[PDB]
Ligand binder design. Sequence first.
Ligand SMILES: NC(=O)c1ccc[n+]([C@@H]2O[C@H](COP(=O)([O-])OP(=O)(O)OC[C@H]3O[C@@H](n4cnc5c(N)ncnc54)[C@H](O)[C@@H]3O)[C@@H](O)[C@H]2O)c1
Ligand SMILES: NC(=O)c1ccc[n+]([C@@H]2O[C@H](COP(=O)([O-])OP(=O)(O)OC[C@H]3O[C@@H](n4cnc5c(N)ncnc54)[C@H](O)[C@@H]3O)[C@@H](O)[C@H]2O)c1
Lengths: 339, 339
Amino acid sequence: MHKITLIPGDGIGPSIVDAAVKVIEATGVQVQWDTQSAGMAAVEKFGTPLPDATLDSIRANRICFKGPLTTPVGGGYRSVNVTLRQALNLYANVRPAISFEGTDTAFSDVNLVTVRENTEGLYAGIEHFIKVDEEKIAAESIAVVTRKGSERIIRYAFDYARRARRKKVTLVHKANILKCTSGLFLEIGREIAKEYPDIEFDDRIVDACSMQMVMQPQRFDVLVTTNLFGDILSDLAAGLIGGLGLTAGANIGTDAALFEAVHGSAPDIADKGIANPTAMIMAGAMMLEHIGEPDAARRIERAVREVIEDGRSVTPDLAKDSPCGTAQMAEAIVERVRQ
Amino acid sequence: MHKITLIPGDGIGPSIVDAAVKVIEATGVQVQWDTQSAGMAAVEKFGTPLPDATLDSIRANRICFKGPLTTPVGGGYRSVNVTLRQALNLYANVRPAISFEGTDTAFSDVNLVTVRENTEGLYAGIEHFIKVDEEKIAAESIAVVTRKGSERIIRYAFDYARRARRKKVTLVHKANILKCTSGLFLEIGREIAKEYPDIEFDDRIVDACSMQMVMQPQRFDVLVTTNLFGDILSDLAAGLIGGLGLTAGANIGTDAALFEAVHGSAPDIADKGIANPTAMIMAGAMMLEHIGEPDAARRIERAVREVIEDGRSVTPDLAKDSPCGTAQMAEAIVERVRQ
Ligand SMILES: NC(=O)c1ccc[n+]([C@@H]2O[C@H](COP(=O)([O-])OP(=O)(O)OC[C@H]3O[C@@H](n4cnc5c(N)ncnc54)[C@H](O)[C@@H]3O)[C@@H](O)[C@H]2O)c1
Ligand SMILES: NC(=O)c1ccc[n+]([C@@H]2O[C@H](COP(=O)([O-])OP(=O)(O)OC[C@H]3O[C@@H](n4cnc5c(N)ncnc54)[C@H](O)[C@@H]3O)[C@@H](O)[C@H]2O)c1
C-alpha cells in the first residue's frame, strides 16, 4: 500500500534503521521498501555520495526513510542530507521535543516543536577561500535569506500551530547583528503573524533563547527559525529531553517528505550494537502519520513511551547501570506494539 | 592608582554598574573613574551611539568597565559592543562559567571557560539586501575567517589553559557545512595544537556540542570557537549555572581590555530595580585581576558566593522565595567583601 525509499546510511545507521523497519512492520502497515544507497556507504560502493538512482527513487516514491549520513569536515563532498532537502524542496524541518516519562532528566514537562527553515541560510553552499596562488589567507561563507523562503517557513509554523492545537509561535533570530538576513526574516515574521490573530507571536534573539531553553524550556511551544539556528536549538532541546538518541525530524515539502533521526552516524559507537533506536523509530511514527496511518503512528509512540517508562530494556544512553543493546530495545518495542 | 573608562550603558546597565562600582570601592582599590557614554544613552544625549571622546578615553586609559549596550534589531546603528571590540582589537572574549553553590540548578559542578573569537566571523559587518527598486527579494550576510585571526584566538585559548592550569581545549565548529570558514578555523586549530602537547585537544560540531553541554557540562574545560558560536554557547553555559544575571566576560587585546556582563540591557525589567548585579560585579572582579589586584578580585568573588549561598538577600532571578532588589544584594555583597 506504501512504496517508500529506504536509505540505511552510515555508522549506526543500518542497525537503527533495521530496528525501525521491524517496529513499523509490527504495526501491520504494508510497506514496499525501495532500498537505495547514500552517503559514505555510497562513496565506498559506487564512488559517489548520491547515486542518481537514489534521487530518482525518491522523486518517484515521494516518501523516504533515511538513516544518518556522514558528512566530511573541512573538505570532501557537501552534505547529502542538505542536497536531498534542497533537491526535493523539503523546506520545513519539523523537530518535536516532548518529554518521555522515566528519563533521567532535570525536566519532565518539555513540549516544544522546532520548525527549521531547511533549504537556505548558511546551508546555501556558498563559500570560498581568498588565496594568493595556493596560499589561503582568508575564507568567506555566505548566508542567504529569500523573501519567499522566509514566507513559506513562517506560514508553515503558524499552520502547524493551528493543526496541532498549539498556542504560540516564537521566531528566533539574530537581527541585531545580522541586520539584513535575520532582520528580513524577523520583519516577514511580524508581517505574517497578523494573518494568524488566533496564535500568539513573539521573537527572541538566539543567544538569550538558548539560555532560556536551558533554564525553563516550558516557555516554548512552536519555535520557528533559520537553518543553522534550528540545527543548534533542536540539538539543545534533544539534550533537554534525554539525548539525540530520542529525537526525530520530518523534512516536509509540498510534493515529498523525508523522515530521519536528528542525530548523526555516531562513529564513536558504530558497530558496538548499543545505539538507541528510539529516534529512528519516532521518525517512523512521524512518517506513518504523514502518509495517512495515524493509528499505527500512535501505537508506535505509545510502545516507545511504555518501554522507556518501564526502563528495563533500554540502551546505555538512557539507563547507565543495567542496559541492553539496540536489538533488544527494539524487540521490546515490537512486543509492546503487538500488545 | 588606576584610571578606568566607565560606561553605565542602557536599560539595567546604570543600576548594576552602580552596584559594581560600590563593591569595587569596598575592596579599597584606588580607581579614578572616567565616565563616558555609549549605546542608546549616547544616542539620546549626544545624537551618536559612540562619541569620539568615549573611544579616545578608552584608548588613553586602556581599561574599560562597560554596562550592557542596546543594539537595535533589523536596522539602526551597528552594535557598539562589536565596534568597541574591533576598534580596540580586543580579539579574545573570555567567559568563565563556574557553578555557584546554592543555585536552583540541575548541575553544581560546572567549571568551563569559553574563549570566543571577538573580531570577525559573522560579526564582520558585511551584509546586503538584494532589491529591485525598493522591494527586498533576498538578503545576504558574509562570515569572514582570516588565518591570523584564527591563529591568535586559538593560541590565546591554549596559553590561557596553561596559565590557568586547565587541561583540555575543545575547538567548536561547523566544518562539515561551513567547509571554508569553519574548516580553516579547525585546520589551523589542529596545527596549533601540536605546539601544546601538554594540553589535551579535541573538536566538536556545534550542535552535538550544545547537546553535550546540556547533558554533561563537566566534560568541558576550555572551549575555543568563532564569534557567533561563542555567543550562543556562552549563553547556554550561563543558563547552566543559573542565568545571565551571574556571568561575566573579558574582552582582551594586546594593548587594552574591556570588562562587562554577558547579558544585555534587559528592557523587560529596566527601571524595576530587580536586576541581578552579580554578573557586573564578577566583571569587576575579572577587571581587578587583570590590572594587578588579584586579592581584591578574590575577595569580591568570595563575597558574591557567600551572599548567593546564604540566599536571603538575592534578586528574584535566583529565588522568588524571599526576594529583594538590586540595591539589597549589592549592600549584602559590600558587607561581605568588607569582612
Ligand atoms: N541528518 C543526519 O544525517 C545527521 C545529523 C547530525 C550529524 N550528521 C553527520 O554525522 C557525523 C557525526 O557527527 P557528530 O559526531 O558531531 O554527531 P553524532 O550525532 O553522530 O554524535 C553525537 C553524540 O551522540 C551520540 N549518538 C548520537 N546518536 C545517538 C543514539 N542513536 N545512540 C545514543 N548515542 C548516540 C554519539 O555517540 C555522539 O557521542 C558527521 O559526519 C555529521 O555530518 C548526520
Ligand atoms: N552589552 C552587550 O554585552 C550585549 C549582551 C547581550 C544583549 N545586548 C543587547 O541587549 C538588548 C536586549 O537583548 P535580549 O533581550 O535578547 O537579552 P537580555 O540579556 O537583555 O535579556 C534576556 C533575558 O535575561 C534577563 N536579564 C538579563 N540580565 C539579567 C539581569 N542581570 N538579572 C535578571 N534579569 C536578567 C532579561 O530580563 C531577559 O528576560 C538587545 O538590544 C541586545 O543587542 C547587549
